[PDB]
């Protein structure tokens, strides 16, 4: 459902 591909990944 969550549509983000990179946004939710923390660097």
């Amino acid at each position: 459902a969550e549509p983000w591909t990179v946004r939710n990944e923390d660097l």
Epitope: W4, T5, V6, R7, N8, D10, L11
Partner: antibody, heavy 118, light 113 residues
Framework: EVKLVESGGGLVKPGGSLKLSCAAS????????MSWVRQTPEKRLEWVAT????????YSLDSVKGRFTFFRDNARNTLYLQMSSLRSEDTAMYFC???????????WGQGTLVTVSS | DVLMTQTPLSLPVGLGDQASISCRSS???????????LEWYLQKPGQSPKLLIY???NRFSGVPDRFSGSGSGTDFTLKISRVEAEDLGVYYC?????????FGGGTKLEIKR
């Protein structure tokens, strides 16, 4: 560098339809989600929708569900917004925009203008 | 839905001085992953919005450290230092933690002369 170019904006009558496109360049398109954001003539910003890298997972404003549809063609580096049942209030400048690690709206295009009236 | 409110509506400041802008959320904005996706945008006249600040206080590459954001819970603040004329335009806060994602109404920064 990263470039986004919207197109298709124009004059449409209440009730009508209109498809918009956002050509993307300078990055691997399928690797990132994209958003549509619109701005009213009096400058209010409103998120419309976000669609995942491969197109399967979409979110959208409830007031545009069913009338507006969102999809992308990765091999052609192009994102779409198929509009129908347009109303006065849909009138806005329409911007696509790419995600990035930690940021929603990292890169924006120039925008394409949709005017809904008769 | 989350409502995002900004104050003031506009703000004059002189060259060299510091502006300070508030953004308050009608409810908390911690994403299910425990992050807080509060972001700050600048739209200069005649142009598209550009990103300054993400996840409350991270400076996007290219953006000088005259700009920095802060705050928690429901209350955020963006601070511009050593203001130049080129910094004028409307500054927008945005929560991207709970759908539907919402922007504040904008704060116009005016440069005194």
């Amino acid at each position: 560098e990263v470039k986004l170019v919207e197109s298709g904006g124009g004059l449409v009558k209440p009730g009508g339809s209109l498809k918009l496109s956002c050509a993307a360049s300078g990055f691997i398109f399928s690797n990132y989600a994209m958003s549509w954001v619109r701005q009213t003539p009096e400058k209010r910003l409103e998120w419309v929708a976000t669609i995942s890298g491969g197109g399967r997972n979409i979110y959208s404003l409830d007031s545009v569900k069913g009338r507006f549809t969102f999809f992308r063609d990765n091999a052609r580096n192009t994102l779409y917004l198929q509009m129908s049942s347009l109303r006065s209030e849909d009138t806005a400048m329409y911007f696509c925009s790419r995600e990035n690690y930690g940021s929603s709206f990292t890169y924006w295009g120039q925008g394409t203008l949709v005017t809904v009236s008769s | 839905d989350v409502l995002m409110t900004q104050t003031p509506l506009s703000l004059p400041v002189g060259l060299g001085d510091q502006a300070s802008i508030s953004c308050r959320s009608s409810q908390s904005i911690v994403h299910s992953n425990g992050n807080t996706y509060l972001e700050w945008y600048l739209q200069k006249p005649g142009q598209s919005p550009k990103l300054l600040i993400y996840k409350v206080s991270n400076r996007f590459s290219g953006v000088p450290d005259r700009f920095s954001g802060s705050g928690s819970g429901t209350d955020f603040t963006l601070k511009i230092s050593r203001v130049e004329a080129e910094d004028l335009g409307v500054y927008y806060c945005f929560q991207g933690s709970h759908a539907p994602y919402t922007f504040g109404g904008g704060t116009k920064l005016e440069i005194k002369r």
